[PDB]
Amino acid sequence: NTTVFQGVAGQSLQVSCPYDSMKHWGRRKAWCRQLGEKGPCQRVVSTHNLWLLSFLRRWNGSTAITDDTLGGTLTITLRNLQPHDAGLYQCQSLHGSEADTLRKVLVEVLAD
């Protein structure tokens, strides 16, 4: 199975994705949306291009991404959660023409 991450609409949700800091050393990370069982993963956010500045929060839409490089932890922060933000998502390590799946996370949004 995969881990479920619940968030109240309008509030922020912080998803964690630990990874081997040495196996993926020098590889940027991404956070994408799964569109089906065999469907593609549509990119939502990506860490900063420079590998040093990956710890900072790269913002796309209302989704920020930080990458603790030395500790090896990919944090995603979805602020002002909306119902259309609900779905299955992937943490990915990008290398060359490929992307390895670190963790599959189901994001669900609750009312107030």
Epitope: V4, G36, Q82, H84, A86, G87, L88, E108
Partner: single-chain antibody, 231 residues
């Protein structure tokens, strides 16, 4: 292939409990959100409850909130609604509903069940439809308007309920047509006012049409409905 079969409807005396079980066949159950939507006899639609793909997220309407309990079993592909401490106004046709989004809310309730009758012996976003009644002839361009109170951008859905039959998703995202919808239907709109257009009306289009807010604010409220009957 796809089928949703409700069970448990009938008569229940007031105050008592009642369980409704929906059997699902012909699709991927564990991936799609599910729900129950009611229709009072000869009245418009009204959302009852929604349940998550993992079952760990339930959303009841404010009326039934605190009394009903939605449930699901993915190993048996069944969707339950437990109506404890019923009431006299709860009576309606209850419809088992698929969400049609891979772990997301997707486009809208795509496939509806045929529903079961539950009778009992005795702020919000207002979605208003103009008009309520309309008498047209075969081959008439018809226009229906749907108005929201607060802006909803482009997250409007149009459903078409045939006389006595279960509804079906017609227009998703206001602009685009559902796969299989005839070419003549044309949805449009943005913000607060939205319009649906029938160009060259055909005989099987005489029916009730409902609009719904779907995507922005979790009060996924339906419209009051427009009855396109015959002249």
């Amino acid at each position: 292939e796809v089928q949703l079969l409700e069970s448990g409807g009938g008569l229940v005396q007031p105050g008592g409990s009642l369980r409704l079980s929906c059997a699902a066949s012909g699709f991927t159950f564990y991936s799609s959100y599910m729900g129950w939507v009611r229709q009072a006899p000869g009245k418009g639609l009204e959302w009852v409850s929604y349940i998550s793909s993992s079952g760990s997220s339930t959303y009841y309407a404010d009326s039934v909130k605190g009394r009903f309990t939605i449930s699901r079993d993915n190993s048996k592909n069944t969707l339950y609604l437990q109506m404890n401490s019923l009431r006299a106004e709860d009576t309606a046709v209850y419809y088992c509903a698929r969400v049609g989004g891979y772990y997301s809310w997707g486009n809208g309730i795509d496939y509806w069940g045929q529903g079961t009758l539950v009778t009992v012996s005795s702020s919000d976003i207002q979605m208003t439809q103009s008009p309520s009644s309309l008498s047209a002839s075969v081959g008439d361009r018809v226009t229906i308007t749907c108005r929201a109170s607060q802006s909803i951008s482009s997250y409007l859905n149009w459903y078409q309920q045939k006389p006595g039959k279960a509804p079906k998703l017609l227009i998703y995202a206001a602009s685009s047509l559902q796969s299989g919808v005839p070419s003549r239907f044309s949805g449009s709109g943005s913000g607060t006012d939205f319009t649906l257009t029938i160009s060259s009306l055909q005989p099987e289009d005489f029916a009730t049409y409902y609009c719904q807010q779907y995507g922005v604010y979790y009060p996924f409220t339906f419209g009051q409905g427009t009855k396109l009957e015959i002249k």
